[PDB]
Amino acid sequence: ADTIVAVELDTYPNTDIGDPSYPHIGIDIKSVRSKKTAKWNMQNGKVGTAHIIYNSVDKRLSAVVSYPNADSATVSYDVDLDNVLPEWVRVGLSASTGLYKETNTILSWSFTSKLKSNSTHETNALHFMFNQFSKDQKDLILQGDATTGTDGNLELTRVSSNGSPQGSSVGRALFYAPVHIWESSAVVASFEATFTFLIKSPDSHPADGIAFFISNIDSSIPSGSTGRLLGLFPDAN
Amino acid sequence: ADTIVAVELDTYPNTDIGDPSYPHIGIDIKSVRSKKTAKWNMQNGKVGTAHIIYNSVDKRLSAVVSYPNADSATVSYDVDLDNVLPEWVRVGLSASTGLYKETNTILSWSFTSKLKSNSTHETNALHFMFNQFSKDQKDLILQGDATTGTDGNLELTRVSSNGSPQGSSVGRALFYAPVHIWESSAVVASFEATFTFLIKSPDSHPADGIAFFISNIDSSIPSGSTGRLLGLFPDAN
Ligand SMILES: [N-]=[N+]=NCc1cc(C(=O)NCCCO[C@H]2O[C@H](CO)[C@@H](O)[C@H](O)[C@@H]2O)cc(C(=O)NCCCO[C@H]2O[C@H](CO)[C@@H](O)[C@H](O)[C@@H]2O)c1
Ligand SMILES: [Ca+2]
Ligand SMILES: [Ca+2]
Ligand SMILES: [Mn+2]
Numbered sequence: 081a082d083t084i085v086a087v088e089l090d091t092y093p094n095t096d097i098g099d100p101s102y103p104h105i106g107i108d109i110k111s112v113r114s115k116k117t118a119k120w121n122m123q124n125g126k127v128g129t130a131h132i133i134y135n136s137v138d139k140r141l142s143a144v145v146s147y148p149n150a151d152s153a154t155v156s157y158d159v160d161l162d163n164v165l166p167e168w169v170r171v172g173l174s175a176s177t178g179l180y181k182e183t184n185t186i187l188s189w190s191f192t193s194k195l196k197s198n199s200t201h202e203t204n205a206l207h208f209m210f211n212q213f214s215k216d217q218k219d220l221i222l223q224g225d226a227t228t229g230t231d232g233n234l235e236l237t238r239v240s241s242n243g244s245p246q247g248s249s250v251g252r253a254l255f256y257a258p259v260h261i262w263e264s265s266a267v268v269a270s271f272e273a274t275f276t277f278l279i280k281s282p283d284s285h286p287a288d289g290i291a292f293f294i295s296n297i298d299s300s301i302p303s304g305s306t307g308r309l310l311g312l313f314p315d316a317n
Numbered sequence: 318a319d320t321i322v323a324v325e326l327d328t329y330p331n332t333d334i335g336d337p338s339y340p341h342i343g344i345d346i347k348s349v350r351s352k353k354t355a356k357w358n359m360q361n362g363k364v365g366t367a368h369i370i371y372n373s374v375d376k377r378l379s380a381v382v383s384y385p386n387a388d389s390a391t392v393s394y395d396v397d398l399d400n401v402l403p404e405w406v407r408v409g410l411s412a413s414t415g416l417y418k419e420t421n422t423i424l425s426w427s428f429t430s431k432l433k434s435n436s437t438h439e440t441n442a443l444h445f446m447f448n449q450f451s452k453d454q455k456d457l458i459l460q461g462d463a464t465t466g467t468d469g470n471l472e473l474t475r476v477s478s479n480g481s482p483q484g485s486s487v488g489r490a491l492f493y494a495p496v497h498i499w500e501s502s503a504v505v506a507s508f509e510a511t512f513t514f515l516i517k518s519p520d521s522h523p524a525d526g527i528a529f530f531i532s533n534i535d536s537s538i539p540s541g542s543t544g545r546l547l548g549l550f551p552d553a554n
């Protein structure tokens with residue numbers, strides 16, 4: 081059982097497991113049943129941007145998702161990640177499809193993490209920024225159907241030669257190095273993540289969504305976690 | 318209207334037309350509604366083996382399907398093929414997908430048929446064995462989406478470049494030469510069929526199955542027989 085904290089861009093309402101009856105962004109703490117959600121006007125075919133922020137002083141996890149010339153969706157939740165996640169973790173992106181599908185394209189991804197301790201200017205930091213993915217992206221752990229190189233983008237789920245999405249696909253991309261997300265002696269700990277995506281669906285029923293997540297270092301795709309589970313959870317508990 | 322006798326490896330339960338509520342192997346005499354069925358623990362992603370046997374003395378059609386280190390499923394039915402099939406027929410393999418899908422890969426296929434008459438030691442026989450299929454398999458009649466050559470296997474249904482199965486696909490492969498399956502003057506008539514298959518599905522809902530069948534010589538894929546009809550029957554009567 082991995083420990084998962086995630087911000088989900090959920091495109092398909094699975095009402096039987098808690099989803100609001102419309103596309104939404106949500107904050108998931110160890111469960112696919114978002115602790116908090118917000119309505120999201122997902123725009124089929126357009127490039128969007130997501131910003132996730134957190135700092136140990138406020139203990140507030142917030143996410144903003146927007147499209148150019150459009151309103152943005154915000155969701156924020158009070159949580160002390162010290163009581164939830166192990167000290168070291170891996171961060172990544174996840175996406176899936178089920179009966180319904182969509183392309184889950186990542187055009188760019190950046191992450192920053194900082195630990196400031198009880199010392200004179202003694203800050204530890206990690207920062208990576210990808211604006212172009214390559215055929216052999218060695219600093220990324222690709223899991224499931226995830227692939228890179230196609231137009232310099234990261235395709236989290238299966239796409240056919242003619243560019244059409246496929247169902248029952250699940251894929252993840254985790255940054256290669258473990259991240260020191262919190263530490264008992266830290267005065268302030270914080271991280272920020274940003275990624276631009278392109279979700280396109282041939283019909284009017286896209287599924288299932290993309291997610292930014294933080295997990296235990298050795299995390300892997302749970303069995304049968306395609307569709308509603310976003311490639312993150314073993315079940316809907 | 319073709320005459321069809323078949324042993325089906327049904328992976329998807331279509332309860333509204335008779336299927337038990339689980340994967341099963343069954344004997345179909347002129348109807349998709351199996352005269353007899355048996356529970357089958359289909360193992361996703363593994364190579365299985367099917368053996369079909371029949372002799373005119375017992376007038377018993379039996380089938381055994383198994384996987385290495387696993388139990389096998391058996392189904393047997395009393396039928397006098399003389400009253401059902403014409404004297405000459407074609408034998409083959411059929412498979413399909415509907416809304417749900419699976420790869421329907423044949424790795425090998427062999428068939429033996431014998432007619433022993435009231436003539437001291439005068440036996441007629443036909444035997445063919447395929448352990449490798451080639452790009453141009455001239456002794457096979459391919460119908461629907463069926464293709465050969467891909468890794469030396471026979472793909473009964475459509476598979477995309479990246480190896481993922483597709484829906485609404487139907488394909489058949491019939492041995493080129495007509496088979497003399499029975500004859501009024503025969504003391505004993507018998508046939509045996511064996512094939513190994515690989516059914517793989519990306520999710521947990523595989524469909525629709527593979528079938529070994531015997532039909533009239535000029536048989537072709539019934540219109541709209543994808544999905545539940547296994548590319549064998551025009552309807553669910
Ligand atoms: N598209 N569409 N359509 C209608 C439809 C809708 C739903 C549906 O909207 N479900 C919602 C939850 C999806 O839930 C799934 O998708 C969502 C969204 O991605 C995910 O979030 C979930 O986690 C899950 O993956 C289910 C079924 C269905 O089960 N049909 C069964 C008979 C199919 O009968 C057909 O297929 C059979 C087998 O191949 C054949 O035997 C038969 O002849 C015929 O061809 C059918
Ligand atoms: Ca959902
Ligand atoms: Ca069925
Ligand atoms: Mn949701």
Ligand SMILES: [Mn+2]
Nearest residue numbers: 327336343351
């Ligand atoms: Mn059946």
